[PDB]
Amino acid sequence: GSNQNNF
Numbered sequence: 001g002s003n004q005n006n007f
């Protein structure tokens with residue numbers, strides 16, 4: 001799957 005980090 002795909003991953004997104006929004007710091």
Ligand SMILES: [Zn+2]
Pocket residue numbers: 001002
């Ligand atoms: Zn993956």
